[PDB]
C-alpha cells in the first residue's frame, strides 16, 4: 500500500491493487494481548466500513467503478488531462475535502433512484 | 461530459492517534514472551516525489510507548514481594573502613516472620541514601508516602529492543532525510509496518545505547526562544562510557512473610572503593567542541557556556542510569566544569523512578563486580534566564528519552476510497 | 430503521433502504470499555450473519431479490391485494412464524439445485 | 402464479435482553471519562399507526443499569484506603453542649502507622450511629461482618446524567403516550438510539431530581391486589425540598498505613444544631390531596389513610438520600402523620448502601455548611394486610428507583430479512 | 463439513455446500467469557480471510469458479479421469502443497491482467 | 487443454493448536454458569474410506484443558478467606482414645480477630499430617513456603462433566476404532463439534469414574523401552470401590479476620475409627490377572511382578483422591502385595495439589458420615531399572489423568479453498 502515491493520478489509477490486497493483514492478560485484540478488532471494523460504503453504492465488490451522477463544476473546473497527469491523489482530495460529504450523500441517493428505477419489475 | 467514479485503494493517508502492538525478535520486564514474533524481513517502500510535515515533539507514538511501558513495569511488579513489614526502627552503626571513602550502615531490626512468635534481629546493610533519621534511629526513606515491592531477581530489567508495529489500515511513515531536525517538511520518505531498533533505555542527561545521528549533529527543541522546553542533541559519534562498581557484596536471603523472601546486602568482601564512571576526556572534549560549534551555528555568533544542574533532586542533577541490576547516579559536574575522566557515582536502592506518587521499587543487590560499557549518544540540555547562553543537563520528563528514537515515525490511516471523473456510463 | 412499519406491506416495500443502511452504525478497563467492545463485536456478528444468509441464497448483495420456488398454499391463502395493501409486516411474520424455518431450508436447497443446473458448464 | 422474494431491511423488531453501552455528555464515580461522547443531535422517528405491549416492571434495561452501577461503584471503590487498622477499642466521651440536641462522641484510639513503633492517641469524632458498644468502650459498627474502604475525596459522587445507547441492530422503542401506566399497549411510539436524561439518583420514599410526569398523576404497581409488590407514584408537579446541615466541621487528615490517609471529624466550630429538611407544607398538602384523589380513582370510592414505616432499618424507615458528600436519613413521619414543615434528619457515615453482605463505605466529611435543594417527584408506597387502605413509604429494593425513569424504554433487535410473494422469475 | 472427504474428487465436487454453509456457526470475567470471545473473533477472522482470498480472485461470491490460467504440467501429469475418480482432496493437496503459494500468486496476477483488459472502457 | 478452478469448501483439514471453549449441560469450581449451554443433539458424521495418524500423548487438548482447569481453580479460589493470621504457635495434646487407632491433636492458639484487643484461645483439632513440630509446639505444615486460602464451603468441588467444543472452522476428529492404542493410524473416524463425557476427576494410581474401554484392555505408553515415561492401562470392566470415613465431626465456625470465618474440626461424636476403602478382592484378582495377561502379550513371554511405590511423597505413593468434600490418601500396598479387601486411608486437610510452589488449600470439614462409591477404570503404571519386569503405581504428572479420556480427539482447521483442473474458460 501507499505505492505510486508520488506518481500522477492516472499512474496511481493503475497500481491500486496492492492497497486493496493488503487491508486484512500486514506488509507480507493485559500485558499485550488486549492491545493486539483491540488492534485486530479495529482492523476488521475498518475493512467492514469500507465494504459497507462500497455496498450502499453501485460498486459492491469492484475495484473500478462508474456512476451515473455527473458533478457540478463548482467543486473543480480543472481540465481532465491536467487532472490525471500533473498532481497526486492527496492534493486532489484536499481540493475536494470540503465537498466529500456532499458527494457521498449524492452517491447514496443516486443509487436509491437507480435501484427504484430497476425495481419496476 | 464526465462522470464521477469510485476507486478502491487510492494512496491517501489521514492523521494519527491509533493503537500500536508490540513485536519482539528472536524473560524480562517488558514481556518479550507476550508480543507476536517479528517477521524480520526488512521491507520498506520509498515514496518518490512526496513531502509532508513532521512535528516530532508532539507525536502520538511517544505518549503511547511511555504510557505502555509504565503499564508493563507496574504490572510485572504487581505480584512481587511487598515491603510493609520491613519498616521497623533500624538500630544502625558505621561499617569498618580502611581508606577515605557516611555511605553504608549496618542496620538491625525486628522482622515479623512466623506471626506472634520470636522475631529475629537480622542485621542488614543499607546505603545512606535509602535511610532517613527520625531524630541511632533510622527508617526506610520510602515508608512515609508509599510502600513498594522489590523487583523479583528471577526477572531481569536489562533492555532488549522492542519493535512497535501498526495494525491493518495503518502505516508508519518514516522520514529518511539526514539533516532532519524533528519538525518541518522533509523529502525521501518511506513507509514501514514495524519500527526499527528503539531500545527502551531509561537514562538522564546522557542517552545511553541510543541510535547515532548521521552526517552532522542535530538540535531539537520546541521553541529555541522559550526556556522551559527541553533540548535534545544527537551525537555525530558515540562517546564510549565505562562505569564500574568495584565491590564484592553478599546477598542475605532473609525471610519476611510466609513465602515472602527479602534480599539485603550481606557484607563487602575486600576493599571498599567508590562506584565510578569513566569517559575518554580527549574524545569528550572533541565532542563538546563539535556540539558547541553546532549550537553556535544556531545563534548569532554568541559565546556559549556550560554549567551543571542548579538545585534539583538526585534523580535530576545526576546521570541517573540502570546498569546490570543496579541504579547509578553520577555527579557529572566534571564534564561540564590519553587521560581519562572519572565520575564519582553513588548507587541507590529504593528509587522513585518516573517520579510517581505511590510507586517506588527495591532493587535486590547483584553479587558484586558489575560493569557497564555503553555509548553516550545524546545530550539533554536546557537553558535558564547578559550576552551569554548557559546550558545545563536537565531531565525530569522521561518522555524525551523515547522522543530521541521515535523522531522519525508517524502513524497514518489509509483512505482507500477515492473519487475522480472520467468518461464512464452505466 | 423501523420506518413505514405502520404502513402497508406494499408501502413498506418501497422504504426499505434506511434499515439496510443503518445497520453498521447508529441513528445518524472494565468500567465501560469491555461493554462497548462486546457491543461492537455483537454488531458485526449480526451484520455478518445477515450477509451469510443473503449469500447462501441467490440474493448476495441485493436489496430486492426473487426466487424460483413458489410456496405452498397451506402457509397462507390470502389474496395478494389484501396482503400488500391492508397489512403490515409484523403479524404477517407472526402468521408465517410457524413456517419460517421450512422456507429457509427450502430456499437453500432450491439455491443448490439452481447452481448445479448452472454448474453444467 | 407467485414466487417468494427476499427483501433486505423490512421493519420487523424482535425481543430484548442485549447489552447497552454508556454515553456521557460534555471526575465522578460512574466514570464519565470512560463512555463515548454523545453526539447530542436529538433525533427520533415517530412510528405512525403502530401499537405494542410494554411491561415496565419486568424490563431488562433496569436490571442492566443497576447491575452495572454496582460494578462501577464497587470498582472505583477498589483502590481507595481500606479501614482494617482503624478498628481498635475506642475510649470515647460526650461532646460539649449548650442547647438541647447522645449524637456525637469524642473517641480516642491507638493507630498503627509506622509499624512496631509508637502509636498515636489521635482523638476523632464519631456519630452515635457508627458506633456499637461492646459492654466507655465502643467500636465501629461495620467491623463485625465486613471491612470497607473510605471513598476517596478526590472523586465526587454527585450524580450527572447518563445516556444509555444501543449498538447496531438494536433500537430502543420509547412510548410517548402521556397517560401510560407502565404496562399495557400504547400508541404514538417513537424509536431512539440513546436514552434521555436518567440521572442515577439513589434515594428512598422520595424520588429526588427525577423526571416529572405529564398531565395527570400515574400509578404503577405489579398487582394492585398483591401487597408485597411495590408501588410507584409520579408527581404532577415537583415539590421543592431544601435540606441543610448547619454546622462547620473540621477534617483531621490523619495517617494510618504508609500512604494510607484517613479523614475523621475534627471539631465543630460554632453552634450545635440538628440537620433538618424543609418542605412547603401547603404545597405538600395540595400534592397529597391530589395523589390520594388519584388513588381513590383506582379504588371503589374507598377511604385511604397514610401511615409511616412499621419496623424496618434506618435505611428503610427514613428518607435516605445523598447530599453534596454526606448521607442523610430523615424521619418522614411528619408528612404522613406559608408555614413550612421541618424534617429532623440524622447523618450517617459508615453506610451499607444497596444492602450488600461484604460492602460498606466510609464517607469523608465535607467542610461544613452543606445544603441540597431538590425536587420531590416520586413516591414509593406499599400497603399491608377492614374497609380502609393504609399506605406507607417503603423501599428495600433499589431497582425501583431506576424503574421510575426507564418506564418508557424497551430494547428490540431488528430482523432485516423479510420474505413475501410477487411475480418475479429468474 | 468434512463430508464426502472419503469419496472421490468428483463426488466431493458435488457435496461442497455443507462446508460453505457451516462456517459462521457450529454443527446445527476471565472464567470462560474471554475464551469464547477470542474463539468467536478467530471464527470471523477466518471467514473474512477466506472472503478476501475469494474476492481478490475472479470468484467473489461463487462456490464454483473457473479461471483463465492453465497450469504447467510439472505440478501434475495425472490423467483427468484418474484424478477425479480415484483419490481424495487431501492427497491431491499433499501432491500440490509444494506449489500452492505459486499458483495463488499466479491467480492474483492473472486476475489483475483480466481487470486491466476489461478496464479499457 | 485444462484450466485451474477454485472450489469453496473442499474437505481438507490442517493441523492443531487452536483455542476451545467450554460447554456445560443442564454452583461448583469449574463454573458451569459460565459456559454456553450445550445443544445436546448428539450428532456426528462418519468419514468412510479415510485414515489419519493420532499421537495421543502429545495432544494439544490435554494441555489446554489442564492449563485451563488450573486457571479455574486458582481463580475461584481467589476471593476466599486467607490463612495468614492462623499460623501462631499451637499448644496441642492428644485426643481421648478407646481402641487402637498420633493422628489427631487438640491444638490451641491465639487468634487476632478484633485487632489490638483480647484474643481468644479457641481450641481446634488438627490431623498429624497438617502439623510440623518446631522443636508441645507445632505449626501448620504449609506456613513455611506458601500461604493458602480455604475453599469456601458454599461452593462444591465434586466433578460434573464438561464438554469441550470447537469454534467455527475447527472440528475435532474422533477415532472410533475399538483396539486403538493411542498412537498410530486408525480407520472409521468421525467428526465432532463437542466432546463427550470427560469429567475432570483428579486422582492418582486409580482412575475413578472414568470412561471404560471396549472389547479388550489397552496399553498406552510413550516408549515401552523407556522407563521414565508413564504407562496408562484401561480396564475391560470397572472394579467397584467403596470408600468411607466413619466418624461424626463437628464444624467450629470461628472468627479470624473481620468478615473472615475459618472452619475447624470441633469434636468427634462416637467411636474413633479409621478411614478405609473397600474393593472386591475376587474382582480385583480377576482384573489383575487379565491386565497382566494383556501386558505379557506385549512382552516376549516375560514374567511380570507388581510392587508398590518406592520413596515418593504422600501425594504419589498413595491413591490420592477427592471424596465428597474430603481428601483421601490410601496406602494401596495391599492390592499389589466373597472376601473384600480393605485399604487404610489417611485424610489430609492442607494439601499442595497439582504440586505448585505458592499454592495449597484448606479443605473445610464435612459434617461426618461421608461415603464415596466409584469405579476404578484405569491404572497408572511405571517400571524401573534381571529377567523380570516390575510395575508400580506412579503419578506425579497430573496431565495423564486428562489423557486417559481425550485419547480419541484431535483438533483440525478446515481449508475450504481448493484448486483443481477442468475444462472451464472465461
Ligand atoms: C559503541 O560503538 C560501537 C561501534 O561499532 C564498533 O566499531 C568497531 C570499530 O570502530 C568495530 O570493530 C565493531 O565491530 C563495531 N561494533 C560493535 C563493537 O558492536 C557500536 O557497535 C556500539 O553501539 C557500541 N559498542 C559497544 C557498546 O561495545
Ligand atoms: C425544581 O423545579 C424546577 C422548575 O423549573 C424552573 O421554573 C422556574 C419558574 O417556575 C423558572 O424560572 C426556572 O427557569 C425553571 N428552571 C430551573 C430553576 O432550573 C426545575 O427546573 C428543577 O427540576 C428544580 N429546580 C431546582 C432544582 O432548582
Ligand atoms: C460402575 O458401573 C456401573 C455399571 O452400570 C450399571 O450396571 C447395572 C448392572 O450391571 C445396572 O443395573 C445399572 O443400571 C447400571 N448403571 C448405573 C448403576 O448407573 C456404571 O453405571 C457406573 O459407572 C458405576 N456405578 C456406580 C458409580 O454406581
Ligand atoms: C444544484 C445543487 O444542488 N447544487 C449544490 C448546492 O448546494 C449549491 O448550489 C452549490 C454548493 O453549495 O453546489 C452544490
Ligand atoms: C409437498 C410438501 O413438501 N409438503 C410439505 C409437508 O411438510 C406437508 O405435506 C405439509 C406441511 O407439513 O406441507 C408442506
Ligand atoms: C514458465 C514458468 O513460469 N515456469 C515456472 C518456473 O518457476 C520454473 O521454470 C518451473 C518451476 O520452478 O516451472 C514453473
Ligand atoms: C543498637 O546498637 C547499639 C550499639 O552500641 C547497642 O548498644 C544498642 O543496644 C542497640 N539497640 C538499641 C535499642 O539501641
Ligand atoms: C527488637 O527486639 C529486640 C530483642 O533483643 C529488643 O531488645 C528490641 O528493643 C526490639 N526493638 C528494637 C528497639 O530494636
Ligand atoms: C561529523 O564527523 C565527521 C567524521 O569525520 C566529520 O568529518 C564532520 O566534520 C563531523 N561533523 C560534525 C558536525 O560533528
Ligand atoms: C577508570 O579509570 C581509572 C583511571 O585511573 C582506572 O584506574 C580504572 O580502572 C577505570 N575503571 C574501569 C576501567 O572500570
Ligand atoms: C478513657 O477516657 C477516660 C476519661 O475519664 C480516662 O479516664 C481513661 O484513662 C481513658 N482511657 C481508658 C483506657 O479508659
Ligand atoms: C493505647 O495507648 C495508650 C498509651 O497511653 C495506652 O495507655 C492504652 O491502654 C492503649 N489502648 C487503650 C486502652 O486505649
Ligand atoms: C395537574 O396539574 C394541573 C395544573 O393546573 C391541574 O390543572 C390538574 O388538575 C392536575 N391533575 C392532577 C391529577 O393532579
Ligand atoms: C428551614 O425552615 C426553618 C423554618 O423555621 C428555617 O428557620 C430554616 O432556616 C430553614 N432551613 C433552610 C432554609 O435551610
Ligand atoms: C499448653 O497445654 C499444656 C497442657 O499441660 C498447659 O500445661 C500449658 O500451659 C499450655 N500452654 C502452654 C504455653 O504450654
Ligand atoms: C496466648 O494467649 C494466652 C492467654 O492465656 C497466653 O497465656 C499464651 O502465652 C499466648 N500464647 C501462647 C503461648 O499460647
Ligand atoms: C473382556 O471382557 C469380556 C467379557 O466376557 C471377556 O470375554 C474378555 O475375555 C475380556 N478380555 C480382556 C482382555 O480382559
Ligand atoms: C468395608 O468392608 C468391611 C469388611 O469387614 C466392612 O466391615 C465395612 O463396613 C465396609 N465399609 C463400607 C461398606 O463402607
Numbering used by the authors:
A (entry chain B), C (entry chain D), E (entry chain A): 522 to 549, 568 to 660
B (entry chain G), D (entry chain E), F (entry chain C): 35 to 60, 68 to 142, 154 to 187, 191 to 322, 322A, 323 to 353, 355 to 392, 411 to 458, ...
Quote the study on this structure:
The HIV-1 envelope (Env) trimer, comprising three gp120 subunits and three gp41-transmembrane subunits, uses multiple strategies to evade the elicitation of neutralizing antibodies. The HIV-1 Env is heavily glycosylated with N-linked glycans that shield potential neutralizing epitopes. Soluble Env trimer immunogens that have been removed by genetic cleavage from their native membrane-bound form, however, have exposed protein bases that become immunogenically dominant. In this study, we introduced N-linked glycans to cover the artificial protein base of soluble Env trimers, in an attempt to focus immune responses on the neutralizing epitopes.
Constructs with the most added PNGSs, N28-JCBv3-660-665, for both BG505 and ConC, were selected for further analysis as they were the best cleaved, and in the case of ConC provided the highest differential in sera binding. Moreover, differential scanning calorimetry (DSC) showed these two glycan-base trimers to be well-folded, stable proteins with Tm’s of 67.3°C and 76.5°C for the BG505 and ConC variants, respectively. This stability is slightly reduced for BG505 compared to its protein-base counterpart, but the stability is increased for the ConC glycan-base constructs, likely owing to the additional DS stabilization added to the glycan variants. We solved the cryo-EM structure of the glycan-base ConC trimer to 4.1 Å resolution. Other than the additional DS mutation, the structure appeared generally indistinguishable from the published structure of the protein-base ConC.9 One difference observed in the structure, however, was an increase in the mobility in the base of the trimer. The base as a whole was shifted nearly 5 Å, and the C-terminal 10 residues were not resolved in the cryo-EM density. This unfortunately included the region where PNGSs were added, so we were not able to visualize the structure of the glycan additions. Moreover, the N-terminal addition (N28) and the addition proximal to the fusion peptide (JCBv3) were also absent from the electron density map, demonstrating that in all cases, the addition of the glycosylation sites, or the glycans themselves, increased the mobility of these regions. The ConC cryo-EM structure, however, did reveal greater mobility in the base region, and all of the introduced PNGSs were disordered in the electron density. While the BG505 glycan-base trimer did show antigenic evidence of a greater propensity to open (e.g., increased binding to V3 antibodies in the presence of CD4), the ConC glycan-base trimers did not display signs of antigenically opening or disassembling and thus appeared biochemically stable in vitro.
